[PDB]
Amino acid sequence: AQRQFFGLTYNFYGQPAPLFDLNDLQELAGCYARPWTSRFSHLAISTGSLPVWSARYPSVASRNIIVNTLLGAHLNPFAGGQVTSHQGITWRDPVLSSLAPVPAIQPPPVWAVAENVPLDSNNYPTYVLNLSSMWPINQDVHIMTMWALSDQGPIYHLEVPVDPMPAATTAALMAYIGVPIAHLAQTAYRFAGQLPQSPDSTMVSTIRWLSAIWFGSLTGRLNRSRTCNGFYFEFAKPALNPDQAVLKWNDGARAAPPAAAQSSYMRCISPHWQHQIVEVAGALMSQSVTAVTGLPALIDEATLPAWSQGVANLTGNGQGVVPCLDYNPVPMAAARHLQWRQDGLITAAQEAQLNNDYTAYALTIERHLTAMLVANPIAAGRMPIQPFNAADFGQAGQTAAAVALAQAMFV
Amino acid sequence: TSGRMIRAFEGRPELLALAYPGRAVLPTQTKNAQFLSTAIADRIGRLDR
Secondary structure, eight states, X not given: OOOOOEEEOOOOSSOSSOSOOHHHHHOOSSSTTOOTTOTXXXXXXXXXXXOOOOSSSOSTTHHHHHHHHHHTTTOTHHHHSSOOBBTTEEESSTTOOXXXXXXXXXXXXXXXXXXXXXXXXXXXXXXXHTHHHHHHHHHHHHHHHHHHTOSSSOEEEEEEXXXXXXXXXXXXXXXXXXXXXXXXXXXXXXXXXXXXOOSSOHHHHHHHHHHHHHXXXXXXXXXXXBBSSSEEEEOOOTTSSTTOOEEEXXXXXXXXXXXXXXXXXXXXXXXXXXXXXXXXXXXXXXHHHHHHHOOSSEEEOTTSOGGGTXXXXXXXXXXXXEOEXXXXXXXXXXXXXXXXHHTTSSXXXXXXXXXXXXXXXXXXXXXXXXXXXXXXXXXXXXXXXXXXXXXXXXXXXXXXXXXXXXXXXXX | OTTOOOOOOOXXXXXXXXXXXXXTOOOOOOXXXXXXXXXXXXXXXXXXX
């Protein structure tokens, strides 16, 4: 199993302190006052399809964002090698089971406030000793890092080998027929969460393919007329249940393997993701794979924000540096619709209607978020939602390159 | 095979001997014994954590 990890904390958007309050620290959905393995606790039991959000957690991404900010204040052991306290709260034990008020016996030193501190598990030797019980820290820290590096949307990884899907993985995949993406993400999160796993594992490679397949269907390159290995994702009309994409197996044609190995990093370049479940689900699922196996290679700095330029174990500009692509959902949907009519699944009249429906749907997302931002100004003290500008909803980004990659990926 | 994990077969235990050929094989020299001597221990029982 992977015995070392690296990470990076969040960046204060000009504010002087991490953006959370004690109540946020008090109302986590999991076990009391523990951040680990909690990113899905708020929807383990569900009814209906309506997104879950509340007054002080007003977006589907809000809870996870808060958690990331929260962790940024207490991860000192992986930077300074010691446990510290902030505003009179610290960990119960060196195993970091949960947070608690500081005891009045041996108060640990007060944490010095800073941002974007690089992290290395080797600074804290006890983690190696207690790996069997501290394993979930590995997954969560990696998740936090993968979000901290971006100013606009979480970063995640894609790859497809030259060989066909190995038989062992196919045996596992049939267990996940007809399950929506969100459920799959929750399952993927739990798998890499509880116990340490080897990078070489049937389950790991299974999820890796799942990530690739979903992206291929996302562009519409994969559909019921062109499957990966019989697998593909089925979509509902965006006018209603716009997110209930599920996995299907089919007996039809299969896309041929790529000429060479393909791999890249992906990102959403528009604020839409903060209130769109499928982006969160896809990002987390891919990130879960990278968590257990580590980063295949450094990320290209060229398109990243300022604080992300040249992170020690994360970003670079040398030779073995995988580029990162980013896209906007609206043009992506248009391309997906275009693929469908080209493959003949739909007629052009339907394609025009689908674009109108989706654009209207996306408009509500923007309208909701922009109204929600002013209701929770970042200067208040906590950041339930990430700041943005109105123009960010119109950026096309590298969407053209994205669909080009998928076409080169599944062929 | 010490350290591996194997199933129980509580309903009728005689299946236990059949389920995992090779484990605890006598070093006698018989045709089946000679064959079973070539089994690889890592492929007994479950494979994953």
